[PDB]
Amino acid sequence: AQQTPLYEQHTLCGARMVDFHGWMMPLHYGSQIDEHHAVRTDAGMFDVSHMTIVDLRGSRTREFLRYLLANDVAKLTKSGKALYSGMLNASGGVIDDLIVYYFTEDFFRLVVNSATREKDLSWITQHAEPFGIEITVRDDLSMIAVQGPNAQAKAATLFNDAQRQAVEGMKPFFGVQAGDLFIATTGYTGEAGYEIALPNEKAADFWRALVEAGVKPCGLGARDTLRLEAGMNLYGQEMDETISPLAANMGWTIAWEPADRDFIGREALEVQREHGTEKLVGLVMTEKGVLRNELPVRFTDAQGNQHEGIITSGTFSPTLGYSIALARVPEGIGETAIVQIRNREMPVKVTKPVFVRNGKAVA
Amino acid sequence: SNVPAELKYSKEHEWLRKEADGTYTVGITEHAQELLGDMVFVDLPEVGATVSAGDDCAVAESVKAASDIYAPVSGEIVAVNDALSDSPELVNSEPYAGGWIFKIKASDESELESLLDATAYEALLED
């Protein structure tokens, strides 16, 4: 595993480093619970520099993306507008989820996860070729996510005047280049904030300024508890190449209309949607204990027949004060289930696959 | 004082404080809490249980993992720390004070002399 460029900054901030898909990354800086609290109530930040940023240019870029992705970038009509989308294989399974930004008719940007960098880049370069797209992997850039109710105001203390005017009152899911900073109102936590990409050689200093602006360093531990409360998927757990997006609470991201836009996996997905699929739900365990990944989830229908699903992600929610999980389960589950933890069947509530909105329990 | 001077210590990163009444107060060290991370639950033994050293007799649950806590010595449990039910984070914030896990009446004197003193434990961490 590589030592990441912000390593001295992380260690000055008290990081406990762990191996994370080939990079030593902070698991936390002292207390993952404190770090979760900081993002819910003030401001926390995450080194997301091992996301890969991909710039796509050429007259056929929009057409290409309308084919590659299952959401529809035709919906991006204002400069800087972003959307979340799945990228599917021919059989309708999820290769990755990603964010894409529109800048001009012939300039878009994709951001992809570290774990799936190489698979996605290969998929992307294979399918872009016939469209004659200039494809730029921006490994020259680092990126920091600043999240929480005071994240934007704290970050914006570091912006010059041009930068503040460019993002003033910017709505969620926009990204804008302002000087050497690319500033986007995106995030993986359920809170307001930015993700800010900037040259590698500037990142350590910018992290330092952010700490000084009152933004708490936050590690992977907190990144998982915040994202899971917010009902946001993690590739490889909530979905993978064998799982349909309709079985991963990604139905809302499929842009079915207009009907004449074919995209990779659309045919398979149409079939899937007609057969019907399993569904991703929330689970809440108010009794003592922690739900864990891959545990069986069970329920008995009115007829007395048992059905089985599986936890895709489990954790302790600091905001709710109970364990929560996302779980993929047969259609027809009711309001409760049972999860096998050790050799005891723990009852759980079945809920929508989101636990927190606006720092409050979606109760 | 990541290692308080006057305590005894075990291999599995617990500490023991001999009390006025001859019993031992037991908890996990600063080192052990550091590696556990924030505690969200603790499962405690029954008051009155007899344990042998190395029995798994409590569980610390963090956001990441359950983690067994072992009896440092043989004896009978005479108390457990009920504050951990509402404040498990004390294991992290006060590992030598409010974060104590249980109290034990030791039943084997040669076990008690194998325990490390402050300096030996500081040395074990030095590896």
Swiss-Prot record, chain A:
Which UniProt keywords are listed? Answer: Aminotransferase, Transferase
Q: What is its EC number?
A: 2.1.2.10
Q: Which domain of life is it from?
A: Bacteria
Family under the similarity heading: Belongs to the GcvT family.
User: Quaternary arrangement and interactors, per the entry?
Assistant: The glycine cleavage system is composed of four proteins: P, T, L and H.
Q: What does this protein do?
A: The glycine cleavage system catalyzes the degradation of glycine.
Full protein name: Aminomethyltransferase
- Which gene produces this protein? gcvT
From Swiss-Prot, chain B:
The family database entries (InterPro entries) matched by this protein are listed as: 2-oxoA_DH_lipoyl-BS, Biotin_lipoyl, GCV_H, GCV_H/Fam206, GCV_H_sub, Single_hybrid_motif
Q: Which Gene3D superfamilies match?
A: 2.40.50.100
N6-lipoyllysine is carried by which residues? K64
A GO term (biological process) for this protein? Answer: one-carbon metabolic process
Q: Which domain of life is it from?
A: Bacteria
- Kindly list the GO CC terms recorded for this protein: cytoplasm; cytosol; glycine cleavage complex
Q: Please name the PROSITE patterns in this protein's record.
A: BIOTINYL_LIPOYL (PS50968), LIPOYL (PS00189)
Query: Which is one Pfam family of this protein?
Result: GCV_H
The cofactors required by this protein are: (R)-lipoate
Print the keywords alphabetically. Lipoyl
CDD domains listed in its UniProt record: GCS_H (cd06848)
- Cofactor: bound how, per the entry note? Binds 1 lipoyl cofactor covalently.
Lipoyl-binding domain span: 23-105
Family per UniProt?
Answer: Belongs to the GcvH family.
Please give the PANTHER family that the UniProt record associates with this protein. Answer: GLYCINE CLEAVAGE SYSTEM H PROTEIN, GLYCINE CLEAVAGE SYSTEM H PROTEIN-RELATED
Q: What's the stated role of this polypeptide?
A: The glycine cleavage system catalyzes the degradation of glycine. The H protein shuttles the methylamine group of glycine from the P protein to the T protein.
Assembly mode:
The glycine cleavage system is composed of four proteins: P, T, L and H.
**Protein name per UniProt:** Glycine cleavage system H protein
